[PDB]
């Protein structure tokens, strides 16, 4: 395509990202090349414009541009260094030169000044000067544009490294210790008396020198400088001095590849990263290796420990060839069945992840040419202080020490739990949530306290909350208060009492915690046993925010485990080469692509309302991370807008990885949000509003008054406590049987509304009480043996009043159209006779008292519009009783599905 693009010369800019790795486009002029621009967005202006005639090949002018960009970077560096040496403000020079040039100029100036400072041992003055520079950069960051903000942040990272080193040098007691510390720190120098400008600047660490190749790097994600990072740099430069390659091994997520890339950036190189175990072809890798050898770039094998055995052997042979050529000093090595030149600036790095067997090591042929090093997670205190210094926090050292001490204290005192993770990741999450809170309250200790109470506190259990509170009081001297209280609390109360929910202290506490957590977090997890109120909590908060802000809400409730990964994320027809959307990506595209609907002024919620497993979430881990992009296995890479928020409603995290818990805002429901006599009232109101559409006014008011005052929690609390004494098959706690009790009671009451108008008040109350007793018995003790059912009947007749009509084992309201009395009866015992030829049909049943009672209760449960579960030993007669109850009626048709050891979800649909 490039070869055929020798006339327009504008199709190369698409592949500039691939062939340069750092620059995304070439900024053109009407017939000249006026510069380049990187992926982050930054105009590098070439000093000498490149003419582009039509006859010139793409190869020739690309070749001249390759040197021109490096010469331009050196020119920017030289101009910036002189201006900085003159004494220009870092603020006035940021706007002129690219990030790399100002970075290198700063580093060289800092090294030069601190050398003489170490000679004279007067560190306080330069430390104060650097601190003032950092404060100036910090205040200029607030007034920065979209492009300059990244550059300012990177310069802040490097300047805080400078100040850290100067402070450590100042604290050193002896000159020997100061020089020991200065040896490890990566120093920068330039030769003022040399030709070949591109080789003027070099880097000295531990006495080893490395040339600075001036390849443009852009404005990359700078890593925070920590004493464990500089040890990685020292190991890499020690390996590179002796021409050995560079191997890192350690736990995943310790930034091995990022450390290699940061080392490359400091040296001015862009590191070509070969990603492994991504169905990575070998031939393309061999081509990349030949390119690395010929150019001289640094190639890093990310996750090298995961490769096919034959592919691993082939690539190890190639790497050994390259390394042998480098060590010997020979040129024109033999690989790819070809002799190719080998530039002596080539280098190979490898990062090995821990496998299933534990530790992973290099192949045998590479162990004699690679110097392995073990990477570890950084110390919490050092980078805690560094991040607090990234923000404008005062007393950042004391704050970081207090935060780390509090976290360790919590880990030592709080009760052990699966999701209790107080490592470095929790610290970084606390700081990231503390970052946006700076707008509301300043950069004091109370901001950290509020972030801790908004991150750690919700995820803690009930017994550990008091520990959190008292340790927070006794560690942090000041305990703050939250703002924006009255308005959102009143709005939550409105949105809850509108839906019937009871605004208890616990429910309001959980709603407030969820609201504050979703204020900043994007991925939410709600954990708690079935019936705690996760759905009620988040629905109430959604309604409250809709009423408060005025933004509309769009909710997509998806059950993850019902749908396979192909349906949830997207399926590709490998035999026909079409990609299908799936469910999650379809509703993401409907958000990004469409604008006619209310999608910019509305908050999108995707509630994964099912148990989560690592396999499902690893396909969206990029969404959970700071990337905030959904990376499909093939297709467009979808950006999630700020309104798009993912919630996870589950009941356990026994299979969710620590990474997902740390990234996602976790809200743990340690107890039910409402008491028994609040769920009962909510269900009563939800049934009254359903009956309201098919009933008169006064009759309904009187009936609901009778239902409400007929039972009281004083008598029912003893019943609910006694129900736990009974043995329950397929046990479910009574807080979940309340729904069945209330719904069945209300339906039974409503089914006899015709016989209530001409009914006396006393008999009406007796009817309501008897039906309530029946519903309570068949909901609480409905899954008992049958003798324990009689025991529960005695309990019911004891704890209710002694005047209401007693409930017997067969007490049923039978109503005759010729009489007005309720006429409650029991124990009919009918009789039936059948012929010989009817002895076995799938619909012949001998009616006994047990059969009639079971059929009656089953039909009453069906008419209550609630699902039923008949649990019993084989041959007991569950199917027979259903089919008899539904054969008599002309309203229901039975569809019998027979589940087996594995009935897929499409069996039911079929």
């Amino acid at each position: 395509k490039i070869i055929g693009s020798g006339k327009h010369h504008d199709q190369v800019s698409k592949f500039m990202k691939k062939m340069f790795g750092s620059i995304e486009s070439i900024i053109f002029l009407e017939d000249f090349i006026t510069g380049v621009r990187s992926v982050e967005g930054e105009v590098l202006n070439l000093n000498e414009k490149i003419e582009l005639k039509d006859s010139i090949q793409a190869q020739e002018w690309l070749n001249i541009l390759d040197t021109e960009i490096k010469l331009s970077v050196f020119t920017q560096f030289r101009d910036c260094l002189g201006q900085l040496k003159d004494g220009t403000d870092i603020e006035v020079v940021v706007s002129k030169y690219i990030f790399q040039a100002i970075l290198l100029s700063a580093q060289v100036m800092w090294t030069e000044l601190v050398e003489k400072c170490l000679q004279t041992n007067q560190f306080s003055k330069y430390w104060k000067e650097v601190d003032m520079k950092i404060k100036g950069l910090l205040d200029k960051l607030n007034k920065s544009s979209d492009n300059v903000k990244k550059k300012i942040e990177a310069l802040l990272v490097e300047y805080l490294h400078f100040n850290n080193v100067i402070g450590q040098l100042k604290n050193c007691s002896t000159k020997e210790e100061a020089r020991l510390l200065w040896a490890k720190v990566q120093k920068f120098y330039q030769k003022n008396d040399t030709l070949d400008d591109l080789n003027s600047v070099f880097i000295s660490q531990s006495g080893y020198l490395l040339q600075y190749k001036f390849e443009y790097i852009g404005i990359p994600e700078r890593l925070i400088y920590t004493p464990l990072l500089l040890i990685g740099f020292a190991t890499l430069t020690d390996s590179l001095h002796q021409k050995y390659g560079g191997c890192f091994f350690g736990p995943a997520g310790t930034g091995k590849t990022e450390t290699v890339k940061a080392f490359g950036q400091n040296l001015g190189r862009v590191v070509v990263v070969f990603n492994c175990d991504d169905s990575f072809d070998y031939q393309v890798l061999s081509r990349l290796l030949v390119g690395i050898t010929q150019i001289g770039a640094w190639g890093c094998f990310d996750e090298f420990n995961r490769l096919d055995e034959k592919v691993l052997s082939a690539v190890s042979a190639n790497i050994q060839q390259i390394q042998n050529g480098l060590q010997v000093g020979k040129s024109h090595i033999t690989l790819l069945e070809e002799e190719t030149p080998l530039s002596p600036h080539t280098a190979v790095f490898i990062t090995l992840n821990p496998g299933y067997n534990g530790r992973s090591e290099l192949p045998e042929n590479l162990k004699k040419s690679f110097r392995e090093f073990s990477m570890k997670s950084p110390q919490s205190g050092t980078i805690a202080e560094m991040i607090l210094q990234i923000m404008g926090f005062e007393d950042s050292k004391s704050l970081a020490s207090k935060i780390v001490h509090f976290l360790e204290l919590l880990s030592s005192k709080c009760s052990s739990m699966n999701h209790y993770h107080f490592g470095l990741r929790t610290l970084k999450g606390v700081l990231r949530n503390c970052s946006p809170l700076i707008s509301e309250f300043g950069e004091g200790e109370k901001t950290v306290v509020e972030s801790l109470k908004r991150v750690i506190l919700p995820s803690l259990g009930d017994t550990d909350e008091l520990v959190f509170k008292d340790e927070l009081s006794k560690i942090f001297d000041s305990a703050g208060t939250p703002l924006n209280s009255k308005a959102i609390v009143q709005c939550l109360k409105d949105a809850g009492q509108r839906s019937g929910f009871s605004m208890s202290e616990e429910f309001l506490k959980k709603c407030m915690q969820f609201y504050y957590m979703q204020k900043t977090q994007q991925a939410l997890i709600l954990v708690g046993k079935a019936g705690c109120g996760k759905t009620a909590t988040w629905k109430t908060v959604i309604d409250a925010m809709a009423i408060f802000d005025g933004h509309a809400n769009v909710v997509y409730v998806i059950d993850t485990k019902v749908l396979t990964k192909e349906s949830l994320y997207g399926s590709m027809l490998k035999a026909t080469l079409e990609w299908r959307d799936g469910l999650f990506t379809s509703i993401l595209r409907r958000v990004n692509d469409d604008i006619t609907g209310t999608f910019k002024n509305s908050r999108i919620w995707v509630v994964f309302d099912s148990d989560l497993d690592p396999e499902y979430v690893e396909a969206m881990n990029s969404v959970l991370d700071d990337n905030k992009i959904l990376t499909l296995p093939n297709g467009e890479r979808l950006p999630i807008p700020p309104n798009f928020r993912i919630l996870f409603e589950t009941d356990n995290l026994d299979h969710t990885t620590p990474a997902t818990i740390t990234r996602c805002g976790l809200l743990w429901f340690s107890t039910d949000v409402c008491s028994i006599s609040s769920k009962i009232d909510h269900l009563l109101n939800k049934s009254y509003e359903a009956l309201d559409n098919k009933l008169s006014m006064f009759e309904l008011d009187k009936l609901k008054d009778l239902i409400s005052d007929s039972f009281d929690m004083a008598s029912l609390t003893n019943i609910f406590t006694c129900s736990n004494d009974l043995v329950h098959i397929l046990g479910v706690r009574t807080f979940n049987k309340l729904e069945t009790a209330v719904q069945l009671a209300v339906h039974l009451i409503s089914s006899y509304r015709q016989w209530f108008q001409n009914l006396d008040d006393k008999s009406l109350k007796d009817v309501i009480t008897l039906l309530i007793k029946r519903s309570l018995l068949y909901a609480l003790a409905g899954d008992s043996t049958g003798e324990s059912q009689r025991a529960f009947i005695q309990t019911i007749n004891t704890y209710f009043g002694h005047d209401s009509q007693e409930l017997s084992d067969y007490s049923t309201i039978v109503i005759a159209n010729d009489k007005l009395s309720f006429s409650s009866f029991c124990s009919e015992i009918p009789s039936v006779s059948l012929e010989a030829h009817e002895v076995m049909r799938p619909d012949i049943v001998i009616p006994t008292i047990d059969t009639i009672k079971h059929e009656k209760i089953f039909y009453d449960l069906l008419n209550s519009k609630r699902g039923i579960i008949l649990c019993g030993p084989p041959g007991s007669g569950k199917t027979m009783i259903m089919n008899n109850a539904l054969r008599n009626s002309s309203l229901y048709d039975v569809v019998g599905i027979n589940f087996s050891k594995d009935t897929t979800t499409e069996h039911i649909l079929s």
């Binding site: 020997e176 210790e177 020089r179 020991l180 040896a183 490890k184 531990s206 006495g207 080893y208 040890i231 020292a234 190991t235 020690d238 001095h241 002796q242 050995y244 350690g250 034959k310 052997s313 042979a317 050994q320 060839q321 042998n324 033999t334 530790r359 192949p363 045998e364 042929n365 004699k368 110097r371 392995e372 090093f373 073990s374 570890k376």
Partner: protein, 454 residues
């Protein structure tokens, strides 16, 4: 283990030798059948123990002694030794049924085991075979094969032993290291011409070229049965027990044995110090002194590596690459800096963390390396690395050759005490006793489990 494979043919050849070996009239075992059985046991242990490492050598010796004495001796001996192995293993405990004046050698074994001298107790069974273990001289001379595999761990290489043998065995050992495709082609040409010229050839570190051996060497050695009809040449292979699994037919075709010879600390110091000046001096006197100290430190760290979990919680093979990198750093720091000793403080922190502490992934082992470096390098005009030697700092005239001679003399003057692993190293003697008890427990458990099966 993938290396201890045994075939019916080898066993039958070993038994054939039992009759065809009129060395010396052994103990008078009455009937000829008993004497043949004893000779069979002796020959099996003498031949098939070379292919095993030290722990499995002990296991074989104990198990075969038990198998022989469960038939030759009485029940008062059988239950005695069964309970004896139960005592040696830490799984069971009790007193054996010691019959006085009837089982004397068992009483010597009881004296050994009560004194908690596990190594002598385990070597008692080897001593009871009254046979001298075959060295590589015996194996190379006696076995009528042209192929031998020399396995070992990654800490010790027996290439020097094979060189010394072949220089004294009829001609020209020829080392052919593997590696890149150049090494592979050079090796194939060398072997193709050496099977005709007859010189002994060696193939260092087969493992790295596994894919090559699976394709070239495997079918070659399986098909070159006319090599015995070629000139009398011997092709050797060096592998690693912890390395990758060699193909089964290739290993079965060739003879095998395990090189188990760990040199003493002083021996390693002497070898390293001798080898350092063979390549010639690089810098002045202080470079020589620092190279001597580095040799001492490398020997100490390598010696402590073998012990586990006492000393190092794992096994970190400190090869010669670490020594080379540390030597390069020492030359650099003594070149850029001055003659004075001031930068010792940064000689440690680089050696203890970057070159020798890079592989380390646990904090305890890093602390071990750091304290070892602090002990070895921090010195003021008189350094006592081990309680038996004192190293004075260089002279004032700075005569480098005299300094090298003096260091050689101070190496030759001292001798290694038998308790060096507790005195020369910093870990206590009780640690060594616990380690020996653990290894004896492993041996006893394995042999009891084998006895359960047989």
């Amino acid at each position: 283990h993938w290396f201890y494979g045994i075939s019916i043919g080898q066993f039958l050849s070993c038994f054939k030798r039992v009759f065809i070996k009129k060395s010396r009239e052994t103990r008078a075992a009455r009937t000829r059948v008993d004497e043949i059985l004893w000779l069979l046991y002796q020959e099996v242990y003498c031949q098939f123990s070379t292919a095993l490492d030290k722990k499995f050598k002990m296991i074989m010796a104990m198990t075969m002694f038990c198998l022989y004495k469960f038939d030759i001796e009485s029940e008062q001996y059988k239950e005695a030794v069964l309970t004896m192995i139960g005592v040696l293993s830490e799984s069971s405990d009790g007193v054996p049924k010691l019959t006085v004046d009837t089982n004397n050698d068992l009483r010597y074994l009881w004296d050994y085991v009560t004194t908690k001298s596990y190594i002598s107790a385990l070597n008692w069974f080897k001593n009871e075979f009254f046979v001298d273990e075959w060295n590589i001289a015996d194996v190379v001379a006696n076995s009528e094969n042209n192929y031998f595999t020399m396995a070992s761990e990654r800490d010790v290489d027996g290439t020097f032993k094979l060189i010394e043998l072949a220089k004294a065995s009829k001609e020209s050992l020829k080392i052919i290291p593997l590696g890149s495709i150049e090494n592979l082609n050079y090796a194939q040409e060398e072997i193709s011409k050496s099977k005709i010229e007859g010189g002994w050839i060696l193939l260092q570190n087969i493992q790295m070229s596994l894919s090559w051996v699976k394709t070239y060497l495997h079918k070659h050695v399986e098909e070159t049965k006319a090599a015995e009809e070629h000139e009398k040449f011997k092709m050797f292979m060096t592998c690693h027990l912890t390395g990758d699994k060699l193909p089964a037919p290739l290993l079965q075709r060739t003879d095998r044995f395990v090189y188990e010879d760990i040199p003493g600390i002083l021996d390693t110091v002497k070898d390293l110090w001798g080898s350092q000046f063979f390549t010639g001096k690089i810098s002045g006197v202080w470079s020589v002194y620092c190279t001597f100290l580095l040799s001492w430190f490398h020997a100490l760290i390598t010696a402590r590596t073998r012990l586990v979990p006492h000393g190092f919680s794992k096994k970190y093979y400190f090869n010669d690459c670490d020594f080379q990198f540390a030597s390069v750093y020492l030359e650099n720091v003594l070149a850029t800096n001055s003659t004075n000793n001031i930068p010792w403080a940064q000689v440690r922190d680089h050696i203890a963390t970057i070159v020798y502490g890079g592989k380390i992934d646990e904090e305890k082992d890093l602390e071990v390396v750091a304290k070892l470096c602090a002990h070895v390098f921090c010195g003021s005009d008189n350094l006592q690395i081990v309680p038996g030697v004192r190293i004075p700092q260089p002279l004032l005239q700075q005569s480098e050759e005299e300094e090298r001679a003096r260091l050689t003399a101070i190496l030759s003057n001292t001798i290694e005490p038998a308790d060096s692993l507790s005195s020369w190293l910093q870990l206590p003697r009780e640690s060594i006793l616990n380690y020996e008890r653990l290894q004896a427990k492993e041996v006893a458990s394995s042999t009891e489990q084998l006895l359960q099966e047989m």
